[PDB]
């Protein structure tokens, strides 16, 4: 079991969190952004790529759901169909509304005006959702889920994204404090990621 | 009760209308060409949106909810590896084929860029056509969500300005069988019927 992973990449970070939550020690092969063995199993050369015996999977969502189904404990999705769909919809909304901004900010080719606006929008949006972190210990959940596995890599990166949340976002800042301290999250961090804070 | 706000012209809504028909779930189809009940439950106002006593959108979210909520017939494999393979195929169809469909249909695309996207999609589909000789559904013995994503694109080849070459016979044969199937026929809006 191996995972080709960009140690700087929030999408690779998602899969490293899932692996850590499941207690699965994969061989983590660090690939800098942009090797033959990876292109051999995944002609797209995208990261992360999971290889399980001779099975290659890519797309962080595909890989996270495979790991959640293959290694059932602890479950990272709800049990019933509506709640599961709600979790998958929340992952889609995080991708659409937050990850798009992250990707624009971090792309060296983004024009500065666009980078600045992306930062402003992402800061405002995270501040706006903060009240939802007051009453449940995980994001809209009583248990760590794949939703948190998508959120945490973004929140870890706020300093590198140039975003400081305001004091009124305390519920979200408290969620960060609890979540970043958890064993599985600490285990997920690449060397590059640890150096971001 | 169960309703689906649907764009009768759009291939992402067509995906969900295929799944609803396959599952026989008696859903109310509400055609949209911004109803307040829709904006009430989905502030993005995107289509398709499924609503029940539940509010879901994004075609992949909606399709997997339907497959989990209404088990028969199963539209995904049972075991994790095969399920991951199906999910990855859906992603590749989205990235490589749906991206081209969307580019061709976007009113902002340069006509020369539409011609190029038509070529790229035609060639890619032709390159994969031999895999349709090996199994009666796309890399599967049974209709699946992979087919539900592919059939709306294939139904639209004429309106996309794409004619497959005779070399693509197994894919053409797949289209013949699939378009005649009861559920796919039930999925078609009037607007989609006008497309052929």
Short mmCIF file of C-alpha atoms in Angstrom, two decimals:
data_model
loop_
_atom_site.label_atom_id
_atom_site.label_comp_id
_atom_site.label_asym_id
_atom_site.label_seq_id
_atom_site.Cartn_x
_atom_site.Cartn_y
_atom_site.Cartn_z
CA UNK A 1 0.00 0.00 0.00
CA UNK A 2 1.50 3.29 -1.19
CA UNK A 3 0.34 6.89 -1.66
CA UNK A 4 2.05 9.27 -4.06
CA UNK A 5 1.60 12.60 -2.29
CA UNK A 6 2.55 16.21 -2.81
CA UNK A 7 3.76 17.24 0.62
CA UNK A 8 2.68 20.83 0.00
CA UNK A 9 -0.75 19.94 -1.49
CA UNK A 10 -4.01 20.27 0.41
CA UNK A 11 -5.65 17.53 -1.73
CA UNK A 12 -2.82 15.14 -0.83
CA UNK A 13 -3.24 16.28 2.79
CA UNK A 14 -6.86 15.10 2.73
CA UNK A 15 -5.79 11.55 1.95
CA UNK A 16 -2.98 11.59 4.51
CA UNK A 17 -5.58 12.55 7.14
CA UNK A 18 -7.90 9.68 6.16
CA UNK A 19 -4.98 7.22 6.26
CA UNK A 20 -4.01 8.49 9.71
CA UNK A 21 -7.61 8.26 11.01
CA UNK A 22 -7.81 4.65 9.82
CA UNK A 23 -4.44 3.80 11.36
CA UNK A 24 -3.14 2.61 7.98
CA UNK A 25 0.58 3.01 7.44
CA UNK A 26 0.93 3.46 3.70
CA UNK A 27 4.29 4.07 2.12
CA UNK A 28 4.07 7.84 1.54
CA UNK A 29 6.07 8.67 -1.62
CA UNK A 30 6.60 12.45 -1.74
CA UNK A 31 6.34 13.95 -5.23
CA UNK A 32 7.10 17.62 -5.68
CA UNK A 33 4.40 19.57 -7.58
CA UNK A 34 4.33 19.04 -11.35
CA UNK A 35 8.41 9.98 -11.29
CA UNK A 36 8.11 7.11 -13.84
CA UNK A 37 6.30 4.72 -11.47
CA UNK A 38 3.50 7.25 -10.91
CA UNK A 39 3.02 7.88 -14.61
CA UNK A 40 3.01 4.08 -15.19
CA UNK A 41 -0.01 3.53 -12.86
CA UNK A 42 -1.74 6.89 -13.43
CA UNK A 43 -1.33 8.31 -16.90
CA UNK A 44 -2.69 11.67 -15.63
CA UNK A 45 0.23 11.99 -13.21
CA UNK A 46 -2.10 13.60 -10.66
CA UNK A 47 -1.62 13.72 -6.88
CA UNK A 48 -2.56 12.10 -4.62
CA UNK A 49 -2.50 8.62 -6.17
CA UNK A 50 -3.12 5.54 -4.00
CA UNK A 51 -1.74 2.15 -5.12
CA UNK A 52 -3.18 -0.97 -3.38
CA UNK A 53 -1.37 -4.01 -4.74
CA UNK A 54 -1.92 -3.37 -8.49
CA UNK A 55 -5.00 -1.07 -8.09
CA UNK A 56 -4.34 2.65 -8.74
CA UNK A 57 -6.78 5.32 -7.66
CA UNK A 58 -6.67 9.08 -7.89
CA UNK A 59 -8.99 12.08 -7.30
CA UNK A 60 -8.99 12.81 -3.56
CA UNK A 61 -12.73 12.08 -3.23
CA UNK A 62 -12.43 8.68 -4.92
CA UNK A 63 -9.45 7.75 -2.78
CA UNK A 64 -11.06 8.93 0.51
CA UNK A 65 -14.26 7.03 -0.13
CA UNK A 66 -12.28 3.86 -1.06
CA UNK A 67 -10.33 4.09 2.18
CA UNK A 68 -13.55 4.65 4.20
CA UNK A 69 -15.18 1.59 2.56
CA UNK A 70 -12.07 -0.66 2.63
CA UNK A 71 -11.13 0.16 6.26
CA UNK A 72 -14.46 0.59 7.97
CA UNK A 73 -13.30 1.60 11.48
CA UNK A 74 -13.60 4.39 12.54
CA UNK A 75 -16.38 5.36 10.13
CA UNK A 76 -15.79 8.70 8.44
CA UNK A 77 -19.33 9.04 7.06
CA UNK A 78 -22.77 8.67 8.63
CA UNK A 79 -24.80 5.50 8.32
CA UNK A 80 -28.18 6.58 6.87
CA UNK A 81 -28.68 7.77 3.24
CA UNK A 82 -29.86 11.36 3.92
CA UNK A 83 -27.10 12.17 6.38
CA UNK A 84 -24.52 10.61 4.09
CA UNK A 85 -25.78 12.72 1.18
CA UNK A 86 -25.64 15.79 3.37
CA UNK A 87 -22.00 15.05 4.19
CA UNK A 88 -21.18 14.52 0.53
CA UNK A 89 -22.97 17.76 -0.37
CA UNK A 90 -20.96 19.63 2.29
CA UNK A 91 -17.74 18.26 0.71
CA UNK A 92 -18.98 19.58 -2.67
CA UNK A 93 -19.78 23.02 -1.16
CA UNK A 94 -16.32 23.19 0.51
CA UNK A 95 -14.76 22.35 -2.84
CA UNK A 96 -16.81 24.89 -4.81
CA UNK A 97 -16.78 27.83 -2.41
CA UNK A 98 -13.52 27.42 -0.40
CA UNK A 99 -11.08 25.13 -2.22
CA UNK A 100 -11.45 27.12 -5.43
CA UNK A 101 -10.28 30.20 -3.53
CA UNK A 102 -7.39 28.29 -1.93
CA UNK A 103 -6.25 27.06 -5.35
CA UNK A 104 -6.40 30.59 -6.84
CA UNK A 105 -4.43 32.05 -3.95
CA UNK A 106 -1.70 29.41 -4.12
CA UNK A 107 -1.34 29.34 -7.95
CA UNK A 108 1.76 31.45 -8.81
CA UNK A 109 0.00 32.38 -12.10
CA UNK A 110 -3.00 34.08 -10.50
CA UNK A 111 -3.01 37.85 -11.05
CA UNK A 112 -2.49 39.72 -7.79
CA UNK A 113 -5.86 41.53 -7.88
CA UNK A 114 -7.60 38.15 -8.21
CA UNK A 115 -5.43 36.65 -5.42
CA UNK A 116 -6.31 39.53 -3.12
CA UNK A 117 -10.04 39.19 -3.86
CA UNK A 118 -9.89 35.41 -3.33
CA UNK A 119 -8.34 36.01 0.09
CA UNK A 120 -10.99 38.55 1.02
CA UNK A 121 -13.83 36.22 -0.07
CA UNK A 122 -12.39 33.18 1.69
CA UNK A 123 -11.78 35.14 4.92
CA UNK A 124 -15.33 36.55 4.88
CA UNK A 125 -16.91 33.18 4.09
CA UNK A 126 -15.04 31.36 6.88
CA UNK A 127 -15.94 34.13 9.30
CA UNK A 128 -19.61 33.84 8.17
CA UNK A 129 -19.80 30.06 8.83
CA UNK A 130 -17.97 30.29 12.18
CA UNK A 131 -21.16 30.33 14.32
CA UNK A 132 -21.92 26.79 13.07
CA UNK A 133 -18.84 25.55 14.96
CA UNK A 134 -20.26 26.56 18.35
CA UNK A 135 -22.55 23.61 19.05
CA UNK A 136 -21.02 20.51 17.41
CA UNK A 137 -17.43 19.32 17.99
CA UNK A 138 -16.82 18.50 14.31
CA UNK A 139 -18.08 20.31 11.24
CA UNK A 140 -21.88 19.84 11.40
CA UNK A 141 -21.16 16.52 13.06
CA UNK A 142 -20.61 14.79 16.40
CA UNK A 143 -17.83 12.63 14.94
CA UNK A 144 -14.77 13.25 12.76
CA UNK A 145 -15.83 12.77 9.15
CA UNK A 146 -14.60 13.13 5.59
CA UNK A 147 -15.99 16.70 5.78
CA UNK A 148 -13.34 17.52 8.41
CA UNK A 149 -10.71 15.76 6.30
CA UNK A 150 -11.42 18.31 3.51
CA UNK A 151 -11.64 21.31 5.82
CA UNK A 152 -8.60 20.80 7.98
CA UNK A 153 -5.97 21.10 5.21
CA UNK A 154 -7.43 24.50 4.24
CA UNK A 155 -7.56 25.79 7.81
CA UNK A 156 -4.01 24.54 8.48
CA UNK A 157 -2.91 26.72 5.57
CA UNK A 158 -4.51 30.03 6.66
CA UNK A 159 -1.13 31.62 7.47
CA UNK A 160 0.36 30.65 4.05
CA UNK A 161 -2.85 31.90 2.40
CA UNK A 162 -2.40 35.25 4.13
CA UNK A 163 -5.59 34.98 6.19
CA UNK A 164 -6.03 35.76 9.86
CA UNK A 165 -9.52 35.17 11.17
CA UNK A 166 -11.14 37.80 13.38
CA UNK A 167 -11.90 37.30 17.09
CA UNK A 168 -15.61 36.87 16.33
CA UNK A 169 -14.67 33.63 14.58
CA UNK A 170 -13.72 32.08 17.96
CA UNK A 171 -15.89 28.93 17.48
CA UNK A 172 -13.97 28.12 14.31
CA UNK A 173 -10.62 29.02 15.90
CA UNK A 174 -11.51 26.69 18.83
CA UNK A 175 -12.36 23.92 16.34
CA UNK A 176 -8.89 24.44 14.81
CA UNK A 177 -7.21 24.29 18.22
CA UNK A 178 -8.91 20.96 19.12
CA UNK A 179 -8.51 19.45 15.68
CA UNK A 180 -4.88 20.34 15.09
CA UNK A 181 -3.99 18.72 18.45
CA UNK A 182 -5.55 15.34 17.61
CA UNK A 183 -3.13 12.46 17.14
CA UNK A 184 -4.40 11.52 13.68
CA UNK A 185 -4.11 15.07 12.37
CA UNK A 186 -0.58 15.43 13.78
CA UNK A 187 0.29 12.14 12.09
CA UNK A 188 -1.04 13.36 8.76
CA UNK A 189 1.31 16.37 8.48
CA UNK A 190 4.10 16.35 5.96
CA UNK A 191 7.38 17.98 6.82
CA UNK A 192 6.56 20.90 4.51
CA UNK A 193 3.16 21.29 6.20
CA UNK A 194 4.62 21.24 9.72
CA UNK A 195 6.89 24.12 8.72
CA UNK A 196 3.86 26.22 7.66
CA UNK A 197 3.13 26.98 11.34
CA UNK B 1 -43.17 14.35 -1.62
CA UNK B 2 -40.12 13.47 -3.82
CA UNK B 3 -39.46 16.07 -6.49
CA UNK B 4 -36.63 16.99 -8.80
CA UNK B 5 -36.11 20.49 -10.14
CA UNK B 6 -34.61 19.72 -13.56
CA UNK B 7 -33.34 21.63 -16.60
CA UNK B 8 -34.97 19.73 -19.48
CA UNK B 9 -32.11 20.69 -21.80
CA UNK B 10 -29.12 20.01 -19.58
CA UNK B 11 -27.08 16.78 -19.47
CA UNK B 12 -26.44 17.03 -15.70
CA UNK B 13 -30.19 17.03 -15.04
CA UNK B 14 -30.56 14.23 -17.61
CA UNK B 15 -28.21 12.08 -15.46
CA UNK B 16 -30.54 12.34 -12.50
CA UNK B 17 -33.67 11.75 -14.66
CA UNK B 18 -32.08 8.47 -15.84
CA UNK B 19 -31.37 7.36 -12.26
CA UNK B 20 -34.91 8.28 -11.15
CA UNK B 21 -36.36 6.26 -14.01
CA UNK B 22 -34.04 3.27 -13.35
CA UNK B 23 -35.10 3.19 -9.69
CA UNK B 24 -38.83 3.54 -10.45
CA UNK B 25 -39.24 6.01 -7.62
CA UNK B 26 -42.28 7.96 -8.80
CA UNK B 27 -40.49 11.41 -8.53
CA UNK B 28 -42.27 14.72 -9.52
CA UNK B 29 -40.19 16.30 -12.28
CA UNK B 30 -40.32 20.04 -12.13
CA UNK B 31 -38.99 21.69 -15.28
CA UNK B 32 -36.89 24.84 -14.87
CA UNK B 33 -35.85 27.11 -17.77
CA UNK B 34 -35.74 30.45 -10.36
CA UNK B 35 -38.81 29.02 -8.54
CA UNK B 36 -38.91 30.38 -4.99
CA UNK B 37 -39.25 26.89 -3.45
CA UNK B 38 -36.04 25.98 -5.28
CA UNK B 39 -34.13 29.05 -4.06
CA UNK B 40 -35.61 28.40 -0.58
CA UNK B 41 -33.96 24.95 -0.32
CA UNK B 42 -30.99 25.56 -2.63
CA UNK B 43 -29.59 29.09 -2.41
CA UNK B 44 -27.23 28.39 -5.36
CA UNK B 45 -30.33 27.80 -7.52
CA UNK B 46 -28.51 25.07 -9.42
CA UNK B 47 -30.09 22.19 -11.30
CA UNK B 48 -30.76 19.40 -10.73
CA UNK B 49 -32.04 19.75 -7.19
CA UNK B 50 -33.81 16.92 -5.41
CA UNK B 51 -36.32 17.74 -2.66
CA UNK B 52 -38.35 15.58 -0.24
CA UNK B 53 -39.61 16.02 3.31
CA UNK B 54 -34.18 16.64 2.16
CA UNK B 55 -32.60 19.11 -0.22
CA UNK B 56 -29.77 17.92 -2.43
CA UNK B 57 -27.97 19.18 -5.50
CA UNK B 58 -24.91 18.40 -7.64
CA UNK B 59 -25.63 15.47 -9.91
CA UNK B 60 -23.13 13.06 -8.29
CA UNK B 61 -24.48 13.79 -4.79
CA UNK B 62 -28.04 13.22 -6.01
CA UNK B 63 -27.21 10.05 -7.96
CA UNK B 64 -25.43 8.40 -5.03
CA UNK B 65 -28.22 9.38 -2.60
CA UNK B 66 -30.73 7.72 -4.94
CA UNK B 67 -28.59 4.59 -5.23
CA UNK B 68 -28.29 4.31 -1.41
CA UNK B 69 -31.89 5.24 -0.60
CA UNK B 70 -33.55 3.04 -3.24
CA UNK B 71 -31.42 -0.07 -3.63
CA UNK B 72 -32.97 -1.79 -6.66
CA UNK B 73 -31.67 -2.07 -9.23
CA UNK B 74 -28.15 -1.48 -7.89
CA UNK B 75 -26.35 1.16 -9.97
CA UNK B 76 -22.96 0.66 -8.31
CA UNK B 77 -20.86 -2.40 -7.52
CA UNK B 78 -21.10 -3.96 -4.05
CA UNK B 79 -17.45 -4.25 -3.14
CA UNK B 80 -14.98 -1.43 -2.39
CA UNK B 81 -12.50 -1.94 -5.21
CA UNK B 82 -15.09 -2.14 -7.98
CA UNK B 83 -16.98 0.79 -6.45
CA UNK B 84 -13.77 2.87 -6.46
CA UNK B 85 -13.19 1.91 -10.08
CA UNK B 86 -16.69 3.11 -10.94
CA UNK B 87 -16.26 6.35 -9.06
CA UNK B 88 -12.91 6.94 -10.82
CA UNK B 89 -14.55 6.29 -14.23
CA UNK B 90 -17.21 8.88 -13.40
CA UNK B 91 -14.44 11.37 -12.52
CA UNK B 92 -12.58 10.65 -15.79
CA UNK B 93 -15.80 11.01 -17.81
CA UNK B 94 -16.39 14.34 -16.09
CA UNK B 95 -12.86 15.63 -16.59
CA UNK B 96 -12.19 14.43 -20.15
CA UNK B 97 -15.59 14.21 -21.83
CA UNK B 98 -18.03 16.42 -19.92
CA UNK B 99 -15.47 19.24 -19.93
CA UNK B 100 -15.59 19.11 -23.74
CA UNK B 101 -19.37 18.95 -23.84
CA UNK B 102 -19.60 22.00 -21.61
CA UNK B 103 -17.04 23.88 -23.70
CA UNK B 104 -18.97 23.19 -26.94
CA UNK B 105 -22.30 24.29 -25.43
CA UNK B 106 -20.99 27.39 -23.64
CA UNK B 107 -22.21 30.49 -25.54
CA UNK B 108 -18.87 32.23 -24.81
CA UNK B 109 -16.69 29.64 -26.63
CA UNK B 110 -14.95 30.71 -29.89
CA UNK B 111 -16.38 28.67 -32.80
CA UNK B 112 -12.84 27.52 -33.70
CA UNK B 113 -12.47 26.23 -30.09
CA UNK B 114 -15.80 24.38 -30.45
CA UNK B 115 -14.45 22.68 -33.57
CA UNK B 116 -11.36 21.61 -31.64
CA UNK B 117 -13.33 20.33 -28.69
CA UNK B 118 -15.55 18.33 -31.08
CA UNK B 119 -12.43 16.72 -32.62
CA UNK B 120 -10.93 15.90 -29.20
CA UNK B 121 -14.17 14.38 -27.87
CA UNK B 122 -14.83 12.46 -31.10
CA UNK B 123 -11.32 11.00 -31.08
CA UNK B 124 -11.38 10.17 -27.38
CA UNK B 125 -14.72 8.37 -27.66
CA UNK B 126 -13.43 6.53 -30.75
CA UNK B 127 -10.28 5.49 -28.86
CA UNK B 128 -12.40 3.94 -26.09
CA UNK B 129 -14.97 2.32 -28.45
CA UNK B 130 -13.21 -1.10 -28.40
CA UNK B 131 -14.00 -1.47 -24.67
CA UNK B 132 -17.71 -1.56 -25.58
CA UNK B 133 -17.19 -4.89 -27.36
CA UNK B 134 -16.17 -6.60 -24.09
CA UNK B 135 -19.15 -5.91 -21.79
CA UNK B 136 -22.78 -4.93 -22.53
CA UNK B 137 -22.63 -1.83 -20.30
CA UNK B 138 -19.64 0.46 -19.92
CA UNK B 139 -17.04 -1.79 -18.30
CA UNK B 140 -19.88 -3.58 -16.53
CA UNK B 141 -22.30 -6.47 -16.81
CA UNK B 142 -25.13 -4.29 -15.43
CA UNK B 143 -26.40 -0.72 -16.00
CA UNK B 144 -24.61 1.61 -13.57
CA UNK B 145 -24.08 5.22 -12.62
CA UNK B 146 -21.21 5.21 -15.13
CA UNK B 147 -23.77 4.64 -17.93
CA UNK B 148 -26.04 7.29 -16.40
CA UNK B 149 -23.24 9.84 -16.86
CA UNK B 150 -22.32 8.66 -20.33
CA UNK B 151 -25.75 8.36 -21.99
CA UNK B 152 -26.67 12.07 -21.75
CA UNK B 153 -23.42 12.94 -23.59
CA UNK B 154 -23.96 10.28 -26.26
CA UNK B 155 -27.58 11.30 -26.76
CA UNK B 156 -26.28 14.84 -27.51
CA UNK B 157 -23.66 14.01 -30.15
CA UNK B 158 -25.82 15.41 -33.01
CA UNK B 159 -26.50 18.73 -31.25
CA UNK B 160 -22.81 18.83 -30.31
CA UNK B 161 -21.92 18.51 -34.00
CA UNK B 162 -20.12 15.18 -33.54
CA UNK B 163 -20.49 12.17 -35.81
CA UNK B 164 -18.67 9.01 -34.67
CA UNK B 165 -16.77 7.11 -37.37
CA UNK B 166 -17.75 3.53 -38.36
CA UNK B 167 -14.58 2.46 -36.52
CA UNK B 168 -16.53 3.20 -33.32
CA UNK B 169 -19.11 0.45 -34.05
CA UNK B 170 -19.14 -1.17 -30.57
CA UNK B 171 -19.94 2.24 -29.00
CA UNK B 172 -22.55 2.92 -31.66
CA UNK B 173 -24.09 -0.51 -30.91
CA UNK B 174 -24.06 0.34 -27.18
CA UNK B 175 -25.93 3.58 -27.97
CA UNK B 176 -28.54 1.67 -30.03
CA UNK B 177 -29.29 -0.77 -27.19
CA UNK B 178 -29.18 1.84 -24.43
CA UNK B 179 -31.36 4.46 -26.11
CA UNK B 180 -34.12 1.87 -26.58
CA UNK B 181 -34.14 0.74 -22.93
CA UNK B 182 -37.35 1.59 -21.05
CA UNK B 183 -35.75 3.70 -18.31
CA UNK B 184 -33.63 5.77 -20.64
CA UNK B 185 -36.68 6.39 -22.80
CA UNK B 186 -38.63 7.49 -19.70
CA UNK B 187 -35.85 9.91 -18.75
CA UNK B 188 -36.12 12.00 -21.94
CA UNK B 189 -37.61 15.45 -21.82
CA UNK B 190 -39.43 16.89 -24.83
CA UNK B 191 -36.49 19.22 -25.43
CA UNK B 192 -34.13 16.20 -25.46
CA UNK B 193 -36.35 14.27 -27.87
CA UNK B 194 -36.10 17.29 -30.24
CA UNK B 195 -32.30 16.77 -30.24
CA UNK B 196 -32.66 13.66 -32.48
#
